């Protein structure tokens, strides 16, 4: 257990992807915190399955006022969030000349907001205890000729830019940030299918003590399509 | 006058880069359309001096309103936009600790929406005339280490993801989509600090007929410091 | 112990990061062959030490015949090779103009052909099996600005491409092929202190593991946050 | 006429990409030098017809006694070299079970020396007069997923690094280094059409112009839009 005695947070954690990085951080001694506008009744049994301990909250994570109570909230609970996973986005699918300034803006609340306002809210913890984790999902569509996805691109890449720049920000207080890149779900190097629990041990691994001198990098899990 | 006949547009081109581009553009045979929060004397003087027209108008980039006053305007005055630069842009330096999210929030909607607004008022026209370029000022800090530019650097990766997934969707319109990447003013091959000129040949290339088959690109122009 | 019952191939793993990868992958449960110009008694006894089974030869792995006979021991001794980590290499610093043609071929055949020789030794072995993890190390100063190596960058940047491609190719036999990139041996990175050996340990582990089973054809930069890419 | 009175060599410019660069660069100015196994009498004579001088020299640009000779033919000639691109290169598809270390070899030799002993032979000029250009061709295969181009695509990443590293070494110089990644020759591209060698004159002309004096260790892909980096 790589993870004992931390207490990770994951947006966006009610299914998917987050879901399954909450569960696998479990599994190697993580107690959770989960954001999502949805109910997580399954990641959160599943969860205390596996003796650890476990929080839901109902939140938009776009809200500066959503982010800052459930900091609030974590903070009363466990006292600290040593790791903070940046799952929550959305990705719809919109032709340019139909892409309106609201659907934009509102692309970058929920994409990118919410990984800042989570930061605001637990980097100080972070700090206090000189160490700490944040990984950011961003999207191999950033490396790809793919249409309608001007607005999601957008914000995919700042997902990058925001983890070089924060990895600097924070390098000397013993939090590394880090980003996984997966496919938005032949042209793979590996002919298989990604699923959610592709991604799970590059979310431990950079979690975890054996990637400390690691910070600023992308981590494309993929197959092997995109290449950088 | 590989820009013979057109008009380009450069967002927050009443000084340095910008007013070194659009003097370029100009001295390659195009009239110039300038976005500003201030007015811009010396950059029409020397338009001017080039024989080419000019038109400068007070405007905030970053406002939906300003930006399709702005567009009215110059289709009025000179029926279309064929070349745009979104150049545009601040960069403070604050530290995380002392970042806020309305300094986050005003940074994307200066450095980011801007290109978002300007596109939509301009590529209608170039679809249409199946010919246009759009170019995007992004920075090398994009790929350095350097504190204090979360935000910054945030929005630089975001024109980035921009300019690629933009480039995919105009693709087949005849427009091309590229970046600019000037470093933000030992390190660098050439030891000599990077000046305005330093980027007009880029720009000026990247808006020609020589470049009509690159799209979705990001070109540093910084002395040979960043490599990628 | 993710690594148990593999058998892994660390060239120049006599010493430095070489040998620490190796020691590493040993702990994790894993036998060792090491390919190397000088002996490994250190090494050796390490991984005796953690009841692992270990084999150390005499060998330039830019001689093709060398390789050769390598890979032949490799596989009689251990029945086959699962992990393959291509260490070894040089960097003399050697200004541009004092560069000669000899020196600029020497650095490619001891930094790029003696991973394409151990790939061509271990890979059948691998596809038979149909599971398999190559390796390769290149360097940061890939991305960086600096004097002198033009010969050395050359090959490290070979070294990228010999991993991207070679991915491409082995990625249906079930076999993996990346990278990691060290910086070349405080404010230029992000986290200050100076890279040790057993920086590069957990990443090497994790991509030889199947909890980078879907990871391929990536160049993995640990160097404290310095390049961005 | 920005590359006016410059004297411009080629290798592989007797046919395709290189020869269309070679009739830019002479449209722009320059006098042209080619190097390359076969005759150039197509290009030679558009060349010729372009109001400017040219020198074709049969050279196999992997050996360094053609390769030193041609040098010495060029500056014996021209008496000056001021931009080299080393366009010469192949790119035969072998899977990796069938790539021979003999291939392998003759592919570098080609692909990489050729760039290398090329610089050593028009460098030192360049630097004494303190003005060069020096363009590399590479391909954006680098950052493909594409099957039985191990050592292709290893060489072309080799260039650049070879761009990158050199780049750092003539900086200082006025010698600026970059190079151009063409895609290997429809719906994966940004713009579909096919790519033609014209698509790569307007970036050859204008790195080796003084409208990139700025710009050095880059890599320029022109591939209708397909890779992004």
Redesign the interface.
């Known amino acids: 257990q790589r993870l004992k005695d931390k207490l990770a947070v994951i947006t966006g954690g009610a299914n998917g992807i987050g879901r399954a990085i909450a569960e696998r951080f479990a599994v190697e001694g993580a107690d959770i915190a989960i954001a999502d506008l949805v109910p997580a009744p399954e990641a959160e049994a599943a969860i205390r399955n596996l003796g650890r301990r476990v929080l839901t909250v109902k939140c938009d994570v776009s809200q ?1 006022g959503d982010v800052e109570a459930f900091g609030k909230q974590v903070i009363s609970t466990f006292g600290r969030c040593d790791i903070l996973v940046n799952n929550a986005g959305i990705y719809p699918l919109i ?2 000349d139909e892409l309106t ?1 609201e659907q ?2 509102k692309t ?1 609340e929920i994409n ?2 919410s990984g ?2 989570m ?2 809210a637990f ?1 100080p913890g972070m700090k206090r205890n000189g160490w700490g984790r944040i990984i950011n999902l961003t999207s191999t ?10 607005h ?11 983890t ?9 207080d013993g939090i ?1 940030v880090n980003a996984i890149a997966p496919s938005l779900v032949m ?6 299918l ?1 699923v959610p629990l ?1 991604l ?3 979310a ?2 950079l979690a ?10 992308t ?10």
Do not use: C
């Open positions: 500066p032709p340019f300034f934009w803006k970058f990118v907001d800042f306002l930061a605001k980097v569509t950033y490396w790809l000729k793919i249409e309608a996805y001007t999601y691109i957008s914000t995919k890449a700042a997902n990058i830019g925001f070089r720049a924060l990895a600097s920000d924070l390098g000397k590394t042209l793979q190097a590996i002919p298989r990604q592709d799970t041990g590059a431990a691994f975890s003590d054996d990637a400390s001198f690691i910070t600023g990098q981590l494309a899990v993929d197959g092997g399509m995109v290449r950088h």
